[PDB]
DNA sequence: GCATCCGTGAGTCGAGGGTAATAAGCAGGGATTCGCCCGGGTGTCAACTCTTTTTTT
């Protein structure tokens, strides 16, 4: 349970949690705001017009 | 069967006081099993040297005999750091432990 | 029983009853057997008569 | 006071479009859900009486 909790937030510090169907690693809340969907260039600074 | 004002009252009473739902329709008469369930759902409100008592810590616990028999006791000897005794530790556990795998 | 009863509840990602999943497994097994020992591919029309179920249910 | 080991980075706009695998069984009891039907509140109409602005006398 503790592993699931602290992997739901980052998913990178501990062992990687990969779904059985998809071969790509899951994107937790921390990874969602770093480079892909964070405020770097996706939503906050750079957006469609 | 009927669904008068008294039919719902007796049904609610018999469902509240406690009774098998299958026999509820038979006791009321006429109403089937499916009708009473729909009504309650629609309307809502649904030998050794120690016995089994004088067994202290650090003592043997290997049973001897039958528990449902007259005389059933344990060894009760110096058997610290283990549930069973040294004389039975080699007969209870797997003798000659040889197991290994990958890790 | 504990491993099979729990694998069909949490791993599916959606609420699927046990009778539904067992019927799905039986239908898949019979379809594979018919496709392997009858012809090219079993049609859903004959799957109802083979399993003795209505067409609306098998569909 | 140094030697060894674990995090961050990598430009930017455009094209291209959908995906994919394993598979027990049956008996008990309840909760759920789909068909029919009586029904009472909402519409859509024949059909009986005051007012009055003239248009006729
Ligand atoms: Zn003993």
TrEMBL record, chain A:
Role: DNA-dependent RNA polymerase catalyzes the transcription of DNA into RNA using the four ribonucleoside triphosphates as substrates.
Protein name in the entry: DNA-directed RNA polymerase subunit beta'
Annotated family: Belongs to the RNA polymerase beta' chain family.
Subunit structure: The RNAP catalytic core consists of 2 alpha, 1 beta, 1 beta' and 1 omega subunit. When a sigma factor is associated with the core the holoenzyme is formed, which can initiate transcription.
UniProtKB/TrEMBL annotation, chain B:
Assigned keywords, A-Z: Metal-binding, Zinc
InterPro entries (alphabetical): GcrA
GO MF: metal ion binding
Keyword presence, Aminoacyl-tRNA synthetase: no
Protein name (database record): Cell cycle regulatory protein GcrA
Superkingdom of the organism of origin: Bacteria
Binding-site residues for Zn(2+), renumbered to this chain: 60, 75, 85, 88
Pfam family, one: GcrA
From TrEMBL, chain C:
Highest taxon, organism lineage: Bacteria
Entry's localization field: Cytoplasm
Spans through the membrane: none
Assembly, per entry: Interacts transiently with the RNA polymerase catalytic core.
Family according to the record: Belongs to the sigma-70 factor family. RpoD/SigA subfamily.
Protein role: Sigma factors are initiation factors that promote the attachment of RNA polymerase to specific initiation sites and are then released. This sigma factor is the primary sigma factor during exponential growth.
Protein name according to UniProt: RNA polymerase sigma factor RpoD
Full-sequence range covered: 476 to 534 of 652
């Amino acid at each position: 349970l503790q592993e699931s909790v602290d992997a739901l937030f980052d998913n990178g510090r501990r062992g990687r949690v990969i779904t059985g169907a998809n071969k790509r690693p899951l994107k937790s809340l921390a990874d969602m705001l770093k480079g892909k969907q964070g405020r770097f260039r996706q939503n906050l600074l750079g957006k469609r017009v | 069967m009927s669904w008068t004002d008294e039919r719902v009252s007796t049904l609610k009473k018999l469902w509240l006081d406690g009774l098998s739902a299958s026999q509820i329709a038979k006791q009321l008469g006429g109403v089937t099993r499916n009708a009473v369930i729909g009504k309650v759902h629609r309307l809502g409100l649904s030998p050794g040297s120690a016995t089994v008592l004088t067994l202290g810590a650090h003592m043997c616990k290997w049973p001897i005999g039958d528990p449902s028999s007259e005389g059933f006791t344990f060894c009760g000897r110096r058997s610290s750091e283990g549930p069973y005794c040294v004389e039975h530790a080699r007969v209870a556990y797997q003798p000659q432990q040889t197991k290994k795998k990958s890790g | 029983q504990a491993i099979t009863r729990s694998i069909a509840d949490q791993a599916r990602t959606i609420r699927i009853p046990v009778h539904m999943i067992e019927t799905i497994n039986k239908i898949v097994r019979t379809s594979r057997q018919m496709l392997h020992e009858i012809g090219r591919e079993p049609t859903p029309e004959e799957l109802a008569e083979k399993l003795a179920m209505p067409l609306e249910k098998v569909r």
